[PDB]
């Protein structure tokens, strides 16, 4: 009923205040009760599982967080669609968890799938598709895929520069990331050229 709607906002309120003492039981309650209502395979079951998984991730219960997210991802894929936005959202959460836990190789495919969903949903050129590319490029940097890192950061910059103005802060933030990647990979002459472009537009603005 609407009791599930109220119970949901209570789990958010206490988890946001870092009060998992209150948040976890209310979430496990909502979960137990949503199973009696419409079974395990329901969009809202995944919605609750997703919140509880984030609560576990923040509680450093990394192993358990992953099982709830893989559970939610499967429930979403079956009940919403393999290319549904909520499926991409769960995919991101998982890649974030794997990436934070140091498993970049295992995280990369989930992030690349989440990008494929965001492209279908928001269009091949979009400032969220360009946001997702900066995450994916960082993931490759932590592996040594310097060829992929340049390509992803560069495609994000192209989206950012055409969709948002060249003086947008994401243009400089992305250029700063590609610039720092080039330093890592010893491409010092190419990194300096990028730092000159970021500084010259900043100087241009004052005039
Ligand atoms: Mg390679």
From Swiss-Prot:
Location in the cell: Cell projection, Growth cone; Cytoplasmic vesicle; Cytoplasm, Cytoskeleton
Repeat (TPR) residue spans along the chain: 4-37, 46-79, 88-121, 130-163, 172-205
Superkingdom, natural source: Eukaryota
Expression sites (tissue/organ): Found in a variety of tissues. Mostly abundant in brain and spine.
Subunit structure: Oligomeric complex composed of two heavy chains and two light chains. Interacts with SPAG9. Interacts with ATCAY; may link mitochondria to KLC1 and regulate mitochondria localization into neuron projections. Interacts (via TPR repeats) with TOR1A; the interaction associates TOR1A with the kinesin oligomeric complex. Interacts with BORCS5. Interacts with MAPK8IP3/JIP3 and NTRK2/TRKB; interaction with NTRK2/TRKB is mediated by MAPK8IP3/JIP3. (Microbial infection) Interacts with adenovirus hexon-interlacing protein; this interaction leads to capsid disruption at the nuclear pore complex during virus entry into host cell.
Function: Kinesin is a microtubule-associated force-producing protein that may play a role in organelle transport. The light chain may function in coupling of cargo to the heavy chain or in the modulation of its ATPase activity.
Family that this chain belongs to: Belongs to the kinesin light chain family.
Protein name: Kinesin light chain 1
Annotated gene: KLC1
């Amino acid at each position: 009923p609407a009791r599930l709607r109220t119970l949901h906002n209570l789990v958010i309120q206490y988890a946001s205040q870092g009060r998992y003492e209150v948040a976890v039981p209310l979430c496990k309650q909502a979960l137990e009760d949503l199973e009696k209502t419409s079974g395990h395979d329901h969009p809202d079951v995944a919605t609750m599982l997703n919140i509880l998984a984030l609560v576990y991730r923040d509680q450093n219960k990394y192993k358990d967080a992953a099982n709830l997210l893989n559970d939610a991802l499967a429930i979403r894929e079956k009940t919403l669609g393999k290319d549904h936005p909520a499926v991409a959202a769960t995919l991101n959460n998982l890649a974030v968890l794997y990436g934070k836990r140091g498993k970049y190789k295992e995280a990369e495919p989930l992030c690349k799938r989440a990008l494929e969903i965001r492209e279908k949903v928001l269009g091949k050129d979009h400032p969220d598709v360009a946001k997702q590319l900066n995450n994916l490029a960082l993931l490759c940097q932590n592996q040594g895929k310097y060829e992929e890192v340049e390509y992803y950061y560069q495609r994000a910059l192209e989206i950012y520069q055409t969709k948002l103005g060249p003086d947008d802060p994401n243009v400089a933030k992305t250029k700063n990331n590609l610039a720092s990647c080039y330093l890592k990979q010893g491409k010092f002459k190419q990194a300096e050229t990028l730092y000159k472009e970021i500084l010259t537009r900043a100087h241009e603005r004052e005039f």
